[PDB]
A paper describes a structure:
The product template (PT) domains act as an aldol cyclase to control the regiospecific aldol cyclization of the extremely reactive poly-β-ketone intermediate assembled by an iterative type I polyketide synthases (PKSs). We describe here the structural and computational characterization of a bacteria PT domain that controls C2–C7 cyclization in orsellinic acid (OSA) synthesis. Here, we confirm that AviM PT domain functions as an aldol cyclase to catalyze C2–C7 cyclization in OSA synthesis by comparing the products generated by AviM and its mutants. Crystal structure of the bacterial PT domain closely resembles dehydrase (DH) domains of modular type I PKSs in the overall fold, dimerization interface and His-Asp catalytic dyad organization, but is significantly different from PTs of fungal iterative type I PKSs.
The protein crystallized in space group P21 with two independent monomers per asymmetric unit. The structure was solved to 2.0-Å resolution through selenomethionine incorporation and SAD phasing. Each monomer comprises a DHD fold of DH domains, characterized by a continuous antiparallel β-sheet curving around two α-helices (αHD1 from the N-terminal and αHD2 from the C-terminal hotdog folds). The C-terminal hotdog (residues 1056-1174) possesses an additional helix (αC) comparted to the N-terminal hotdog (residues 915-1032). These two hotdogs are connected by a 23-residue-long flexible linker containing two short helices (αL1 and αL2). The two monomers in the asymmetric unit dimerize through N-terminal β strands and bury a surface area of 665 Å2 (calculated by PDBe PISA). The dimer interface of AviM PT is dominated by hydrophobic interactions and hydrogen bonds. However, the two monomers of AviM PT are obviously in a different relative orientation, forming an angle of ~150o. The H949 is from the cap loop of the N-terminal hotdog and the D1104 from the helix αHD2 of the C-terminal hotdog. The Nδ of H949 forms a hydrogen bond with the backbone carbonyl oxygen of I956, suggesting that Nε may be used as a basic nitrogen to deprotonate the substrate. The D1104 is 5 Å from the H949 and the D1104A mutant shows a slightly decreased production of OSA, indicating that the D1104 of AviM PT may be involved in catalysis indirectly.
Numbering used by the authors:
A (entry chain A): 915 to 1174
B (entry chain B): 915 to 945, 951 to 1054, 1070 to 1174
The structure:
């Protein structure tokens, strides 16, 4: 209910390794809603992100994430054991079949990994939203926003956010987002990563994020935000995001979201 | 090896760390009044086995025994192999109300490639040269014969259980403090520089124990079969 997959802390004697263990099934999903491909429930990338943020910052101040790879999706179907590992500046999320007498130590599958780093908050604060006029952002019809947002991502969302306004240009979107749950960054991160693939031009494809070069968050999540999402002009299948609060102060950035 | 504290293997994703977990209880001993103490020999064979999970056999070096493994009821045991370092720890049995009690590290050692040609080149000190006059047991071993000199003993030991090295190692580490001159004190080993074992334990053995002439509170041991072929050595047993 923290929106993370961090369960019971575990230690290795004589080692600064940090572990957390948990069991995942359909009745212990750390998020409220459903995130599913035709009845295939997949843990949202936002949950992986906040899990890594929490694991990074446990005995310390908050971290940014770098080179977050999401190689294999985490499914909720049946029952699986989850291990989150912090080893130095590396965090990993793994799962395996629930151990039993016949297989008391099944091998781990590593789903995702990132590196933790000191957040670049002056970098973050020096960002601002692209100028609407300069990039010719036209306000979009609510009905088409809903259809587009549905088309490019998984039909329902994991979390309680919504788009109250959206302006769109060529490979740029500005979305005014409501996010009443401020108990974690997962809802806003889920909004960013659900809205981001709407920026791609051409025919709508269903995409899922598999990599992020950098995730930086600052402070507690606001309940109203503007989410900017912009195509990388040079590298395919890549989007960059900025989140500001209602007064336009930058509160999160996600660089190099990859949606192949 | 039947006398180790190695329980269920466990792993850390993305790491070559090896873990084993077990619960230690008076009902299921792998080998005072209401308190139980794990013999040093059990710690040694645990570390030998943890060292040699992939490989065939390791020697141990710099085995330190800091806190005895004591139990009056139930305790969780963790054995850790991290590269060439092995550690043994214990804690109160976790539950939902206390889900991650802290580990107490009892002992540690380093693993290394056993020097078996070195071991085979050892032999028992000459009885005549050292003027040997012929004169706890939680396991099944016993001393059937003993010759003693100044700071040296040769003890013929019977050890019917050959399912592990723990009984013979326990005999060595129990008989070694007898090598100290002067009035008998109870001593218990807290450090060993090197432990090397080869093959399966014999059921009859001779144990040599000799004071280090130069360093205080230190004893060296050699274990041979009945024909004097070396099967184990323990160098630098420290008994403060």
């Amino acid at each position: 209910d923290s929106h993370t997959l961090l369960g019971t802390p575990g230690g290795v004697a004589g080692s600064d390794l940090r572990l957390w263990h948990s069991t995942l099934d359909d009745d212990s999903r750390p998020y409220p809603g459903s995130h599913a491909l035709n009845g295939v429930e997949i843990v949202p990338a936002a949950v992986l992100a906040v899990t890594f943020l929490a694991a990074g910052a446990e005995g310390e101040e908050r971290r940014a994430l770098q080179d977050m790879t999401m190689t294999h999706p985490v499914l909720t179907a049946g029952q699986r054991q989850i291990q989150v590992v912090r080893e130095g500046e590396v965090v990993r999320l793994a799962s395996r079949t629930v151990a039993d007498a016949a297989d008391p130590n099944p091998a781990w599958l590593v789903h995702a990994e990132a590196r933790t780093a000191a957040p670049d908050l002056a970098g973050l604060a020096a960002r601002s939203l692209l100028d609407p006029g300069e990039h010719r952002l036209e306000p979009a019809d609510p009905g088409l926003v809903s259809r587009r947002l549905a088309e490019v991502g998984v039909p329902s969302t994991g979390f309680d956010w919504s788009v109250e306004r959206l302006s769109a240009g060529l490979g740029v979107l500005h979305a005014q987002v409501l996010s009443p749950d401020a108990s974690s960054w997962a809802p806003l991160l889920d909004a960013v990563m659900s809205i981001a693939p709407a920026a791609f031009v051409g025919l709508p494809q269903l995409r899922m994020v598999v990599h992020v070069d950098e995730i930086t968050v600052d402070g507690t999540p606001p309940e109203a935000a503007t989410v900017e999402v912009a195509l990388d002009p040079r590298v395919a299948d890549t989007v960059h995001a900025l989140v500001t609060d209602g007064e336009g102060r930058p509160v999160a950035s996600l660089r190099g979201l990859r949606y192949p």
